[PDB]
């Protein structure tokens, strides 16, 4: 009766994931701008 | 026997702490100091633009090898910058160690013979039922 | 202080740190401080703190004083004499129920064992008694290589990494180049000796590099934990500490035998045992015992707070411990009922309030 | 106690409201010990003992007026109070102290206190550099610049292009030197973390007349002087010197508890008052942000006592009983039952390493001077 039952992770990864996604997403536009600047100069 | 019960705070941190927990003002000052070091290296170097692209900022970051030395003065300044980087690394190492040691701030009250909960407070309203054997 | 006078017999050659005259007195101090010798009651030169207070009394109250060394040295406890059942005192206040007496000046604790027959005065310095222990050098010098870690386990992981290098060389077909590359990647070097063509070899090398980084992290974390968590220093804290309470036949701690606190521990039924322990171990001095504690002969020693604090402060060799108990102060001793009681009291009180005790104590102790 | 009928009406009644505490405790214990009875009551007019044109506002005067034998409370031995009456041998030590409270956390960053700038690691660094140079020369069987680059590089960090190996022995020596360097870095990180484990909050003033307590206006900050009218500390502070006295009257607000409440956040930071009372106040203070920076510094080390008459037949027995109580070990238990505080006995920042940056900045300026030599030839 009395007693039958007895009772370096992803938490650091959410912000890192957000920052990595933000940095990766805008890379194409920055490379295009650099290519345009090189072409114009 | 008689014993006391308490709630628990399941979360403790987020593991995603930025440089602001060290100090946000420290982060801004560190960025300013890094910019100053890079500007000083670029000024003393005069490669040129090609050197300044990856002379010290990458070197201060990690080992890329894309720096163009200008004089032995540049080498001495780079050794000094490496020492400063190691100092910052050890400082943030001790910072993280202090945070790890400092975790779990609350202390579980080991009974009422402990005066802590025996001392009346304006924060704890702990009690039992009315009209009990206790 | 008892520093013998100059060879001419005249006390001299004494100046303060800030630069000022130093007051000492001659006083008939028998050089035969040992218990039993041909008596030589030579007048030695003596000074210190209570001498200065007596001089302050002389400057405020007009009188003449003849300070002399006690023939006994014992502070005075009731003692039934041998082959008899008659109770009597001894030592300094054993002289009180004797001839000259008439005055008592020494570091003396407010105590009930003698207060029945005599009266004290108001106290001028409040301090009790505690415990001291000899010291040893720290062992956290980090001199050894793999002592915080396991040297055997370090050998095991070194053999493991050597076997890993050999296995990598087995897949080189270059082999010497591959071994050099592995050893360089062991320490995050990147020399570049070995780049075998096979992609599987490169993948295995990257995996081994990650594993080496992890192993180094584990080694440094274990060493850092061993260094940070190193604190094996722990002495007895308070009378209630059982190590102090348990009488061990290996290490012995004692106090001054037959001196003030002997009755303080003889009256009480709680302690009892350590009183018996000190009965065969408490010494009859205040300096031989303190030099014997550092001699790795006495585990610890119990005595007046100020005495031991000063003795440890002068020579940075030992540290006292334990919060003060049996709190009290020092008061001046008299005989019977001299009218000077109220005058002495009011004088010490006025001096203490005004701010002269602070200067004198800071100067001398 | 007697209460006046409301306030305006001088008449009143002797209301009763039970009282207790350590002085009450010791009172009861001595009462059992000596086997006497008492009708204890409370005083209202004035407080403590201080002649006002040879007028003592009750308390002590209650003993000299032959109006009451025994009067035990918050008793302070002093000069003028040591002749109107006769006291009892004390059993508690306490005097005057300061109770300054700082605004927020105070710690020592120890930015320059790294084990460097000494002769401990300097000798090891010199020996390691000499060994590395000797090994480079041996393996040699331009070069000087590359050797200097290697020595400076794999000491702090390999985060710089200094790659120039020669032979297998060169690789072995580089591996050994890198192992030593990373061991040194790990040891330094561990040592700085261990320093972070320790702390330093030693003191702020360390003296009752050190520098500010001569002319607080001259020092610039006028530290509050919230003493108490016709109290105990005031007589002695005036007696020692009037330098604090001329500014003592600048502030005298309310009782000790109200004074600490105000000084916690209101106007003041430093407080001077009796020792044991402030000890108890600070021990139980909320958050222990109110702690005296004196490490227990006292100018009036004295004792309590009982307010006997001028020869009433109570001195001998009271003294014997009190010494028996202290020796037998009772009011230690009473004190730990009553007097003990809350904390009391139980116990990468911007500015933290800021200064060395400037020093490093100064070091940077040194390099500029070297450029002059580079421009010399």
The two counts, helices (H) then strands (E), for chain B are 5, 0
Give chain A's radius of gyration (CA, Å): 25
- Say what the resolution is, in angstroms: 4.4
For A41, the token pair is 């100069």
Experimental method: cryo-EM
DSSP symbol at D54:
S
Q: Where are the alpha helices (DSSP H) in chain C?
A: 50-60, 91-94, 112-115, 151-170, 175-185, 199-228, 242-245, 261-266, 273-279, 288-293, 305-314, 340-354, 356-364
Q: Which residues of chain B neighbour D150 with C-beta distances below 8 Å? A: none
Interface partners of A (3+ CB pairs, < 8 Å)? B
By the 8 A CB rule, do C76 and C89 touch? yes
Upper half-sphere CA count for residue C325 (Cβ side, 13 Å): 18
By the 8 A CB rule, do C260 and C93 touch? no
d(CA D33, CA D21): 18
The helix or strand, by DSSP H or E, that contains position D129, with its residue range, turns out to be helix D121-140
CB contact under 8 A, B16 and A9: no
CB atoms within 10 A of CB D348: 21
DSSP codes, B75-129 = HHHHHHHHHHHHHHHHHHHHHHHHHHHH---------SSSHHHHS--SS------
Dihedral of CA D27/D30/D35/D36: which sign? negative
Q: Name C25's bridge partners.
A: C46
For C161, the token pair is 């990494």
By the 8 A CB rule, do D66 and D55 touch? no
Q: How far is CA C306 from the centre of its chain?
A: 11
**CB neighbours of D332 closer than 8 A, spacing ≥ 6?**
C325
Between strands D272-274 and D302-303, the pairing is unpaired
C-alpha to C-alpha distances, D281 to C347, D166, D291, nearest whole angstrom: 33, 72, 9
Upper half-sphere CA count for residue C299 (Cβ side, 13 Å): 14
Q: How far is CA B66 from the centre of its chain?
A: 30
Give phi and psi for B60, each to the nearest 5: -65, -30
C-alpha to C-alpha distances, D71 to C267, D41, D88, D102, D305, nearest whole angstrom: 32, 10, 11, 38, 10
Instruction: Tell me which residue has tokens 């060394």.
Output: C69
**C191 in reach of chain D (CB within 8 A):** yes
Burial class of residue D190 in the structure, from the number of CB atoms within 10 Å of its CB (0-12 exposed, 13-18 middle, 19+ buried): buried
**CB neighbours of C6 closer than 8 A, spacing ≥ 6?**
C12, C13
Mutation for testing the B interface, residue in A15, A17, A20 having most B CBs under 10 Å? A15
Nearest of D141, D167, D144, B66 to residue C191 by alpha carbon: D167
Q: Name D3's bridge partners.
A: D13
Give chain C's radius of gyration (CA, Å): 34
Nearest of D363, D330, B43, D317 to residue C115 by alpha carbon: D317
- Beta strand segments in D75-151, E: 93-94, 96-98
**Smallest CA–CA separation between B122 and chain A, in Å?**
34
Instruction: List, as own/partner pairs, every contact residues B58-66 make where C-beta atoms lie below 8 angstroms and the sequence separation is at least 24, other chains included.
Output: B59/D159, B59/D160, B59/D161, B60/B34, B60/B85, B60/D159, B61/D159, B62/D159, B63/C190, B63/D158, B63/D159, B63/D160, B63/D161, B64/D161, B65/D160, B65/D161, B65/D163, B66/D161
DSSP symbol at C81:
P
Q: How far is CA C360 from the centre of its chain?
A: 24
Upper half-sphere CA count for residue D152 (Cβ side, 13 Å): 21
C260 is in an annotated binding site: yes
Instruction: Tell me which residue has tokens 């080498």.
Output: B75
Q: Which residues of chain B neighbour A15 with C-beta distances below 8 Å? A: 16, 18
C-alpha to C-alpha distances, D369 to B44, D345, D360, D362, D374, nearest whole angstrom: 12, 55, 15, 11, 9
By the 8 A CB rule, do D280 and D58 touch? no
Nearest CA in chain B to D360: B84
Burial class of residue C246 in the structure, from the number of CB atoms within 10 Å of its CB (0-12 exposed, 13-18 middle, 19+ buried): exposed
By the 8 A CB rule, do C49 and C9 touch? no
Q: Which of residues 1-40 of C touch D (CB under 8 A)?
A: none
Q: Which residues of chain B neighbour A16 with C-beta distances below 8 Å? A: 16
For C87, the token pair is 């109770």
By the 8 A CB rule, do D304 and D94 touch? yes
Q: How far is CA C365 from the centre of its chain?
A: 16
**CB neighbours of C279 closer than 8 A, spacing ≥ 6?**
C257
**Smallest CA–CA separation between D185 and chain C, in Å?**
10
Q: How far is CA B21 from the centre of its chain?
A: 5
By the 8 A CB rule, do C252 and C292 touch? no
Instruction: Tell me which residue has tokens 């006592």.
Output: D305
d(CA D86, CA D83): 7
D76 is in an annotated binding site: yes
**A12 in reach of chain B (CB within 8 A):** yes
CB contact under 8 A, A12 and B18: no
Q: Name C255's bridge partners.
A: C302
Nearest of C55, C2, C63, C62 to residue C28 by alpha carbon: C2
By the 8 A CB rule, do D270 and D210 touch? no
Give chain D's radius of gyration (CA, Å): 34
C351 is in an annotated binding site: no
**CB neighbours of C144 closer than 8 A, spacing ≥ 6?**
none
CB atoms within 10 A of CB C282: 23
For D25, the token pair is 């405790």
**Smallest CA–CA separation between B21 and chain A, in Å?**
14
CB contact under 8 A, A11 and B15: yes
d(CA C78, CA C81): 9
Burial class of residue C133 in the structure, from the number of CB atoms within 10 Å of its CB (0-12 exposed, 13-18 middle, 19+ buried): buried
For B14, the token pair is 């987020």
Q: Name C319's bridge partners.
A: C133
DSSP symbol at D108:
-
Nearest of D40, D100, D62 to residue D263 by alpha carbon: D100
By the 8 A CB rule, do C318 and C294 touch? yes
d(CA A34, CA C318): 72
d(CA D344, CA B14): 33
* 3-class DSSP assignment, residue B45: helix
Give chain B's radius of gyration (CA, Å): 27
Q: Which residues of chain D neighbour C268 with C-beta distances below 8 Å? A: 328-329
d(CA D72, CA D27): 8
Size of interface B-D (CB pairs under 8 A): 112
d(CA D338, CA D22): 7
Dihedral of CA C257/C258/C259/C263: which sign? positive
For C171, the token pair is 């897949």
Nearest CA in chain B to A9: B15
d(CA C167, CA B120): 69
CB contact under 8 A, B79 and D284: no
Q: Name D94's bridge partners.
A: D302
For D41, the token pair is 């009551």
C-alpha to C-alpha distances, C260 to C297, D59, D242, nearest whole angstrom: 24, 37, 43
By the 8 A CB rule, do B95 and D353 touch? no
Q: Which residues of chain A neighbour B16 with C-beta distances below 8 Å? A: 11-16
What is the biggest distance separating any 2 CA atoms in chain A, rounded to whole angstroms? 85
d(CA C324, CA C127): 8
For D368, the token pair is 């500029």
CB contact under 8 A, B18 and A15: yes
Instruction: Tell me which residue has tokens 């000063």.
Output: C310
Instruction: Tell me which residue has tokens 């000596």.
Output: D34
**D342 in reach of chain B (CB within 8 A):** yes
By the 8 A CB rule, do D208 and D238 touch? no
Q: Which residues of chain C neighbour D332 with C-beta distances below 8 Å? A: 325
Among the partner-chain residues B13, B16, B18, the one whose CB lies closest to the CB of A14 is: B16
Burial class of residue B46 in the structure, from the number of CB atoms within 10 Å of its CB (0-12 exposed, 13-18 middle, 19+ buried): exposed
For B48, the token pair is 């040129």
Instruction: Tell me which residue has tokens 């002592």.
Output: C147
By the 8 A CB rule, do D206 and D23 touch? no
Q: Which residues of chain D neighbour C306 with C-beta distances below 8 Å? A: none
Dihedral of CA B95/B98/C215/C207: which sign? negative
By the 8 A CB rule, do D26 and D92 touch? no
DSSP codes, A17-40 = HHHHHHHHHTHHHHHHHHHHHHHH
What is the biggest distance separating any 2 CA atoms in chain B, rounded to whole angstroms? 88
The helix or strand, by DSSP H or E, that contains position C320, with its residue range, turns out to be strand C319-325
CB contact under 8 A, B14 and A11: yes
């Amino acid at each position: 009766w009395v007693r039958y039952q007895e009772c370096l992770t992803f938490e650091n990864m959410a912000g890192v994931f957000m920052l990595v996604a933000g940095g990766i997403v805008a890379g194409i536009f920055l490379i295009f701008i650099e290519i345009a600047y090189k072409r114009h100069k | 026997g008689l014993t006391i019960l308490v709630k628990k705070e399941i979360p403790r941190s987020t593991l995603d702490s930025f440089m602001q927990p060290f100090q946000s003002t420290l982060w801004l000052l560190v960025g300013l100091s890094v910019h100053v070091v890079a500007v000083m290296l670029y000024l003393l170097d005069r490669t040129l633009s090609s050197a300044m692209w990856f002379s010290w900022g990458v070197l201060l970051n990690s080992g890329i090898g894309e720096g163009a030395p200008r004089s032995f003065s540049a080498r001495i300044l780079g050794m000094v910058w490496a020492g400063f980087a190691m100092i910052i690394v050890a400082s943030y190492t001790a910072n993280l160690a202090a945070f790890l040691v400092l975790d779990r701030p609350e202390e579980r009250i080991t009974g009422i013979n402990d005066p802590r909960l025996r001392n009346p407070s304006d924060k704890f309203i702990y009690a039992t039922v009315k009209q009990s054997s206790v | 202080y008892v520093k013998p006078t100059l060879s001419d017999g005249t006390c001299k050659e004494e100046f303060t740190v800030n630069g000022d005259p130093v007051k000492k007195v001659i006083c008939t101090g028998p050089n035969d401080t040992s218990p039993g010798s041909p008596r030589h009651t030579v007048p030695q030169c003596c000074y210190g703190f209570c001498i200065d207070l007596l001089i302050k009394l002389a400057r405020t109250m007009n009188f003449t004083y003849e300070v002399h060394l006690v023939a006994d040295g014992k502070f005075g406890t009731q003692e039934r004499v041998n082959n008899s059942n008659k109770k009597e005192w001894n030592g300094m206040m054993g002289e009180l129920l004797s001839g000259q007496a008439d005055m008592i000046v020494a570091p003396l604790t407010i105590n009930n064992e003698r207060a029945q027959y005599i009266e004290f005065s108001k106290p001028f310095k409040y301090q009790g008694l505690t415990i001291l222990v000899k010291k040893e050098i720290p062992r956290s010098t980090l001199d050894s290589f793999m002592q915080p870690f396991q040297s055997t386990l370090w050998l095991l992981v070194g053999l493991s990494v050597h076997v890993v290098a050999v296995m990598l060389y087995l897949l080189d077909r270059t082999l010497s180049s591959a071994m050099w590359f592995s050893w360089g990647v062991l320490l995050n070097s990147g020399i570049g000796e070995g780049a075998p063509r096979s992609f599987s070899a490169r993948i295995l090398g990257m995996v081994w590099a990650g594993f080496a980084m992890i192993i180094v992290a584990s080694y440094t974390a274990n060493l850092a934990a061993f260094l940070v968590l190193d604190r094996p220093e722990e002495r007895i804290t308070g009378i209630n500490d059982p190590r102090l309470r348990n009488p061990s036949d290996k290490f012995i701690y004692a106090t001054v035998k037959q001196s003030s606190v002997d009755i303080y521990f003889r009256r009480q039924v709680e302690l009892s045992t350590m009183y018996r322990h000190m009965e065969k171990h408490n010494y009859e001095s205040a300096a031989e015992a303190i030099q014997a504690v550092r001699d790795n002969k006495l585990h610890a020693f119990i005595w007046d707070s100020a005495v031991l604090e000063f003795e440890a402060s002068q020579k940075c060799d030992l540290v006292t411990t334990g919060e003060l108990f049996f709190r009290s102060g020092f008061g001046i001793g008299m005989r019977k009922d001299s009218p000077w009681k109220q005058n002495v009291s009011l004088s010490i009180l006025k001096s203490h309030e005004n701010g002269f005790m602070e200067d004198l104590d800071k100067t001398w102790v | 106690k007697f209460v006046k009928i409301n306030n305006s009406t001088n008449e009143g009644m002797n209301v009763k409201k039970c009282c207790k505490g350590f002085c009450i405790d010791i009172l009861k214990k001595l009462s059992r010990t000596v086997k006497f009875t008492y009708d204890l009551y409370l005083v209202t007019n004035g407080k403590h003992g201080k002649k006002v044109n040879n007028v003592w506002n009750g308390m002590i005067g209650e003993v000299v007026y032959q109006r009451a034998v025994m009067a035990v409370g918050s008793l302070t031995i002093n000069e003028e109070r040591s002749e109107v009456v006769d006291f009892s041998v004390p059993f508690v030590e306490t005097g005057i102290s300061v109770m300054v409270s700082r605004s927020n956390g105070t710690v020592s960053p120890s930015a320059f206190l790294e084990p460097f700038s000494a002769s401990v690691w300097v000798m090891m660094f010199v020996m390691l550099l000499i060994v590395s140079a000797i090994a480079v020369f041996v393996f040699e069987y331009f070069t000087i610049g590359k050797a200097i680059w290697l020595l400076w590089g794999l000491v702090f960090n390999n985060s710089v292009p200094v790659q120039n190996p020669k032979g297998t022995t060169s690789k072995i020596m580089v591996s050994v030197w890198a192992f030593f360097a990373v061991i040194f870095l790990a040891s330094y990180t561990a040592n700085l973390a261990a320093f972070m484990i320790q702390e330093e909050f030693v003191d702020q003033v360390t003296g009752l007349s050190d520098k500010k307590f001569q002319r607080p206006h001259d020092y610039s900050p006028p530290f509050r002087f919230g003493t108490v009218p016709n109290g105990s500390t005031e007589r002695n502070i005036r007696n020692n010197y009037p330098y604090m006295h001329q500014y003592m009257t600048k502030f005298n607000q309310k009782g000790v508890e109200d004074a600490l409440v105000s000084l916690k956040t209101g106007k003041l930071d430093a407080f001077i008052y009796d020792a044991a009372v402030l000890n108890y106040k600070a021990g139980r203070d909320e958050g222990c942000k109110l702690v005296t920076i004196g490490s227990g510094y006292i100018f009036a080390t004295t004792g309590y006592g009982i307010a006997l008459q001028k020869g009433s037949p109570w001195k001998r027995q009271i003294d014997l009983a009190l010494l028996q109580f202290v020796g037998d070990g009772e009011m230690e238990e009473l004190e730990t039952l009553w007097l003990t505080g809350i904390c009391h006995n139980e116990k990468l920042d911007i500015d933290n390493m800021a200064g060395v940056f400037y020093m490093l900045a100064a070091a940077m300026a040194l390099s500029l001077i070297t450029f002059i030599w580079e421009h010399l030839f």
